[PDB]
Amino acid sequence: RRAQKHRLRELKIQVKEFADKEEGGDVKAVCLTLFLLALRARNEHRQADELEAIMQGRGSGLQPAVCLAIRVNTFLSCSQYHKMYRTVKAITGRQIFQPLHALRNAEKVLLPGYHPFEWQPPLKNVSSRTDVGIIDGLSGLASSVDEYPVDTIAKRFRYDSALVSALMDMEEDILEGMRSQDLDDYLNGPFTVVVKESCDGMGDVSEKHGSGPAVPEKAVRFSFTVMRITIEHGSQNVKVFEEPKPNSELCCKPLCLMLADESDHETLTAILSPLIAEREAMKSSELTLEMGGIPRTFKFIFRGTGYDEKLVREVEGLEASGSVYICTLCDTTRLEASQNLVFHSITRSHAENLQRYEVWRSNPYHESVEELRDRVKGVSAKPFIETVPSIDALHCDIGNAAEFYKIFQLEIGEVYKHPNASKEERKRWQATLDKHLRKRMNLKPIMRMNGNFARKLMTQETVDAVCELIPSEERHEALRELMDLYLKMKPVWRSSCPAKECPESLCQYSFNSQRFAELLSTKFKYRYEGKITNYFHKTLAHVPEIIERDGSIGGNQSGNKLFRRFRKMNARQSKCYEMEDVLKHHWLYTSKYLQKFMNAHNA
Amino acid sequence: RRAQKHRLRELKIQVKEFADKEEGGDVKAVCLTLFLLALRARNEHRQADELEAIMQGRGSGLQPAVCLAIRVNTFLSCSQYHKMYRTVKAITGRQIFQPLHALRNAEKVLLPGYHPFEWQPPLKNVSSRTDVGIIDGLSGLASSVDEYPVDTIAKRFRYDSALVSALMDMEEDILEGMRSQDLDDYLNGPFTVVVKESCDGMGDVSEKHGSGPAVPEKAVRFSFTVMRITIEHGSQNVKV
Ligand SMILES: [Ca+2]
Ligand SMILES: [Zn+2]
């Protein structure tokens, strides 16, 4: 290049002097065009569009977000990716991948705390500094010796910044969504965003090959998911964005992680309370953003539905499990639940629960303990988290089949004429049923019940096989009608869109459930022993109100295995940088941008 | 195109004159090196050597063996590799990496038990097949319950297979050494090879998590190592 510079210096002076005498110092672009047409005179057009692509960079360039998605999805550490990059860079001569600092900039553009924004109300008790990332989850606790001891490790994001980064991630999708729904690319807000709210612990995360049992080491995440986005034009609203898979593992963006027990109450609420404060400050605010070159405004709505049963009974203030109070919507006792089957409503709310707890504190009528216990309907603790509860179809049909197995046990028992039996007589009845189902169905019995055995039990042919063993075929007709009502009721909560999929089955729901209640209360009037499952109470009573409220009934070892993967593969030690690392890599794993690049094979 | 051609017709005819007067109708290399010098003075050299590789004729895709090398050296599973391969194929359009078929093909090429060879002695108590690799280390130890009971799993090669495979992939090294130390390629042997051997146990190799410490399971590899290849020609020998 030095001797080429010596042979080409005069020509270089001439081309730069034409550049500054025609364009004004634009030697690069004119050099591009003259070399391009110098190749175009030899009709090698493949190389011409190739040079267009490499000046475009969209050829074999690999924009750093793509290889970042590759490294995150394939679980590569830094040294190995550096090895792969330098080896392919050496063997091809061209630099097809990217180096590490560009990868760090490409990940710094996707973390929380990068884009600017503001809020039309000034967001009381929130620091308006706009470049905060992973902060300490303890919000400045009091870890000194003279204080209450707490040895947990919690790392969190601020709520608003993570919401902002999630919206900036789904920016391109919401652009093409509002294009596809026959509207303009220019449109001010307000976009109203409905957000799923969830929390769950992932059990044990310890890995000890020996040294006895090491540590139980329970931990728990707190996460959210953007469910749907909507917008009006004048008075007509439109769903501008809907999510296809709500409960999947690729759309659960985490706020905070802590290594703590799920039931360790005070530490849990002490870490989770400032995020609650941020949520309630955010409930009555207005976000303003600059995504599509123009400002947009945002309101928000939060649905706390992603909780499980033991946790919602714990963090709202109810009894754990051993009460007479089983319904988290209706105040029906266990006594009345066996008695009244469907005629209830939804009567539990947050503010009245606060009022009931204040009644439990004050005790204004100086009554005794048990009448307080039935007056407040199981309210014992101060409520501190708003939560709208729901169900899932696995618990519904597993409670159904757990009833039905006992129904067939009493049906082979002929217990209507044997008012008592020995327990081992019922064990022999059960064992004859087991031999019977193995000899007819070829089914393998098991004491534990999962969704699989429960789902493959409910067939017309198996209920035919079990009613063929019993005489008095009015019993066969009774279980036939009963199974018919069951299979009618099944795809209602087994559709995920029952307002649209099976509206005929959605209608006549109170009609068929009242029929089935009349069947169980009159014909099979021997199950009435007071034993009733809360799952069954929810399937009988609390179905259609949940349906008209939401419209849906929409993987245990999922977060924990992935958490062990992140902790073991790519992590720093000392228990301080570790949680920041797994939190950051989890947030990078959960981006819509990277997954959208990652599954490009289907196109 | 015709507009900028009209704008730069003087430039085209000017460097046309300069190409005829400097190197005699050599517009291609002159205009190319002008682009290279300009875009390297731009200090954005990734585009520059990309254009250099594409105008030299450097191939985009690569050998299967290099994919095998980087896969082994990074310790990656076939699932994640296949995901990476299909993503780069979907993004780039053209294919650069390889799928698993040619990988396993070049693998069994490089594996022992594939290439023919012979022995001038007949090698008593040794089989005649040249195409057996991995076998049981038990050598037909009947482990029925009526006999002495063991449980030690043992896998092994055949020794001569390992020797000939080690020779065939050090073949390029000994070729370069023969070209370095003043000889030809058309030499015959007998090449004298010095081989040391070793085995050592490694202590526990187990990750027991069902209940903690189950068994200190001790394993042991047995291995060989070449360290010297020589040839004696005429009077003396030479460490090739
Ligand atoms: Ca040793
Ligand atoms: Zn209820």
Side-chain angles (χ1 to χ4, degrees), chain A residues 146-184 186-206 210-396:
Chain A
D146 305 337
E147 202 48 53
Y148 181 78
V150 49
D151 268 13
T152 54
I153 293 94
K155 284 309 184 174
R156 77 178 212 175
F157 275 125
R158 208 178 67 182
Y159 206 62
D160 48 348
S161 160
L163 205 55
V164 161
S165 272
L167 266 297
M168 294 282 313
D169 198 291
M170 64 198 320
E171 179 182 0
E172 298 186 352
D173 175 279
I174 196 51
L175 284 194
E176 196 46 54
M178 68 188 199
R179 278 154 195 187
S180 58
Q181 264 296 327
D182 195 18
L183 287 149
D184 285 336
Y186 65 100
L187 192 139
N188 281 113
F191 290 152
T192 293
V193 169
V194 196
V195 170
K196 195 176 188 150
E197 166 64 87
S198 175
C199 165
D200 184 29
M202 305 317 296
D204 174 31
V205 285
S206 281
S211 317
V215 165
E217 209 191 21
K218 303 184 56 53
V220 53
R221 81 175 170 181
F222 180 76
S223 86
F224 85 114
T225 284
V226 174
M227 179 146 286
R228 82 184 60 184
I229 310 169
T230 176
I231 178 60
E232 74 279 7
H233 56 81
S235 90
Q236 202 69 221
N237 296 70
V238 58
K239 169 177 301 219
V240 63
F241 172 63
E242 196 40 70
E243 263 283 331
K245 283 196 176 297
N247 51 359
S248 157
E249 286 310 305
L250 311 174
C251 62
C252 61
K253 318 252 196 185
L255 267 307
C256 174
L257 267 299
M258 66 281 285
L259 279 76
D261 185 89
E262 187 193 346
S263 87
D264 192 12
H265 197 92
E266 46 265 26
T267 56
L268 186 142
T269 174
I271 305 176
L272 294 183
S273 60
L275 297 178
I276 293 300
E278 294 155 52
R279 197 267 309 279
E280 65 96 18
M282 205 175 301
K283 269 187 194 306
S284 75
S285 46
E286 296 304 316
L287 195 140
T288 53
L289 210 46
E290 206 66 31
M291 33 170 290
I294 45 165
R296 324 291 175 100
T297 64
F298 293 90
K299 296 192 61 50
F300 294 104
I301 274 168
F302 295 102
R303 316 207 57 81
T305 172
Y307 293 154
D308 43 351
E309 194 43 67
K310 192 257 177 190
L311 191 140
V312 64
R313 280 160 178 269
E314 190 173 76
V315 310
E316 207 275 337
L318 304 189
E319 200 267 350
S321 281
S323 160
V324 78
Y325 292 119
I326 60 166
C327 186
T328 77
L329 305 174
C330 75
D331 296 359
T332 297
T333 78
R334 177 182 292 276
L335 165 68
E336 294 169 347
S338 314
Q339 176 50 244
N340 189 282
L341 262 71
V342 71
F343 288 95
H344 317 266
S345 297
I346 292 187
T347 182
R348 277 185 216 253
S349 315
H350 199 77
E352 57 94 18
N353 266 290
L354 289 145
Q355 179 188 354
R356 280 191 193 182
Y357 178 71
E358 207 275 340
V359 169
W360 180 268
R361 169 187 223 169
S362 89
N363 189 11
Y365 324 116
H366 308 271
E367 314 169 344
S368 92
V369 181
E370 283 87 349
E371 43 195 355
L372 261 296
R373 181 62 50 84
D374 53 59
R375 181 161 210 149
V376 310
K377 314 286 175 296
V379 164
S380 298
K382 169 151 203 171
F384 84 111
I385 278 180
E386 286 82 11
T387 292
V388 194
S390 89
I391 46 167
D392 53 354
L394 298 97
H395 297 72
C396 313

Side-chain angles (χ1 to χ4, degrees), chain A residues 42-57:
Chain A
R42 277 83 56 85
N43 299 318
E44 303 155 348
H45 307 255
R46 301 291 187 95
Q47 304 164 337
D49 61 74
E50 181 261 316
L51 290 207
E52 186 264 319
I54 69 158
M55 294 324 282
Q56 207 62 258

Side-chain angles (χ1 to χ4, degrees), chain A residues 1 4-5 8 11 14-15 18 22-23 30-35 37-42 44 47 50-51 54-55 59-60 62 66 70 73-76 80 83-84 87-99 210-213 568 597-598 600-601, chain B residues 1 4-5 7-8 10-12 14-15 18 22 27-28 30-40 42 45-47 49-51 53-55 58-60 62 66 70 73-76 80-81 83-84 86-88 90-92 94 96-97 204 206-207 209 211-214:
Chain A
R1 330 178 184 161
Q4 278 147 5
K5 195 64 157 307
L8 205 45
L11 270 301
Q14 285 144 2
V15 61
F18 180 78
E22 208 270 315
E23 305 267 335
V30 72
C31 165
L32 287 167
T33 45
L34 69 95
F35 180 61
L37 273 306
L39 309 173
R40 276 218 173 273
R42 277 83 56 85
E44 303 155 348
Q47 304 164 337
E50 181 261 316
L51 290 207
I54 69 158
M55 294 324 282
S60 87
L62 296 195
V66 194
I70 291 307
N73 287 258
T74 59
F75 308 136
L76 265 291
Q80 310 156 319
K83 245 161 68 169
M84 179 177 88
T87 44
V88 189
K89 178 181 171 57
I91 195 53
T92 73
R94 84 173 62 182
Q95 189 193 6
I96 175 65
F97 285 88
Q98 318 302 318
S211 317
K568 199 189 146 189
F597 285 165
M598 254 293 311
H601 63 94
Chain B
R1 298 159 176 233
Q4 60 215 358
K5 279 162 219 188
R7 287 163 66 144
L8 296 202
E10 156 63 52
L11 268 71
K12 294 287 245 178
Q14 161 169 351
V15 298
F18 278 115
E22 175 150 15
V27 56
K28 183 178 189 176
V30 169
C31 189
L32 186 41
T33 43
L34 169 141
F35 194 91
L36 312 183
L37 285 185
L39 271 301
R40 284 187 195 272
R42 193 49 260 161
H45 311 262
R46 156 191 304 124
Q47 325 178 341
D49 65 337
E50 170 67 35
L51 189 137
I54 202 64
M55 293 327 279
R58 197 60 178 271
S60 278
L62 70 155
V66 182
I70 61 164
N73 276 250
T74 195
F75 325 109
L76 252 49
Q80 282 80 248
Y81 180 77
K83 196 181 302 158
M84 178 160 92
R86 74 150 191 212
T87 44
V88 180
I91 290 315
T92 310
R94 90 170 58 86
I96 178 169
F97 277 8
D204 191 50
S206 318
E207 284 236 295
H209 343 78
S211 72

